[PDB]
Structure 1
Amino acid sequence: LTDPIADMLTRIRNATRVYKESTDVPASRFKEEILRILAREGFIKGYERVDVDGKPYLRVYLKYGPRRQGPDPRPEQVIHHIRRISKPGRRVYVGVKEIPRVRRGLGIAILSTSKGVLTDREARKLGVGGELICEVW
């Protein structure tokens, strides 16, 4: 394994696309920070720490829309799109004035800064920049 953060985001995307209730991911503190940001913004119901085979895991609880009427009744998504930005093979850093605005304000961007893991609006309010982790809308 080479990218735990991208792996966790892929687990979330794959579990969400089949309307699962919850998905497990190997635990880590940085992953926990990103999950806390996601929960505060309403993209997931929440997360918790559990043990699988004696190993620490994080269980994420997915959230969806109401049932739809028609040929396709599958509910619409709350996480339409989640993408990793900075990668092991190419690191992406932005200053406070290069902070992207995702989806004209409907989406969010997650930043790793010296003040912690922040949303792009949070970082702009604090006037700080750093590594760009991912974008969610």
Structure 2
Amino acid sequence: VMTDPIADMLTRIRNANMVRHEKLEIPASKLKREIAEILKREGFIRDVEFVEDSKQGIIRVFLKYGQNNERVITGLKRISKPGLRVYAKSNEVPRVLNGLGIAIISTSQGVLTDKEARAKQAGGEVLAYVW
């Protein structure tokens, strides 16, 4: 198995994103790490505390969505398909949602956000898209 890691994490935050669970697991990797700092710093989940140990893993985030159904993780989509890769230039870095959501394009200086990557003005692999 293991078709794509970022799709496993996105399916984790999605399926737990509708389950109404307090904490959520993940496979601990550099994409779950840097995507945990980006997606946690933008204010969707409460806190990622990467409780590492032998042999590999393992991240553990909490859903920062209150009483109101559908919190800061309101819907996620694989904008980049590992298998048929997305791409985005500088002027073509698309900001997902329009005014609500935010996309995460893996820039050439770190896994940026949408508006910050447009602040650098350089695109890359479209890493994921959180509508």
Q: TM-score, normalised by structure 2?
A: 0.90
Deviation at 1:56, TM superposition (A): 2.5
Indicate if the aligned counterparts of 2:17 and 2:74 stay in contact, CA closer than 8 A: no
- Give the secondary structure class of the aligned counterpart of 2:61: strand
1:69 aligned residue: none
Q: What percent of counterpart residues are identical?
A: 57
Counterpart AA for 1:65: G
1:72 aligned residue: none
Q: Show structure 2 runs of 5+ residues with no match.
A: none
Greater CA drift, 49-58 or 77-86: 49-58
Counterpart AA for 1:84: R
Change (3 A) 1:95 1:7: same
1:47 aligned residue: 48
Counterpart AA for 1:47: V
Q: Quick check: which one's strand share is greater?
A: 1
Q: Distance in 1 between matches of 2:81 and 2:113?
A: 18
1:124 aligned residue: 118
Q: Distance in 1 between matches of 2:70 and 2:77?
A: 15
Runs of 4+ in 1 over 6 A off after TM superposition: none
Q: TM-score, normalised by structure 1?
A: 0.87
Rg larger in 1 or in 2?
A: 1
User: Deviation digits for residues 61-82 of structure 1, max 9, x if unmatched?
Assistant: 111122xxxxxxxx31121110
1:77 aligned residue: 70
Deviation at 1:18, TM superposition (A): 1.1
**1:102-113 counterparts in 2 under 5 A?**
102-113=96-107
Indicate if the aligned counterparts of 2:44 and 2:65 stay in contact, CA closer than 8 A: no
Counterpart AA for 1:92: V
Q: Distance in 2 between matches of 1:53 and 1:31?
A: 17
Question: How many residues get paired?
Answer: 129
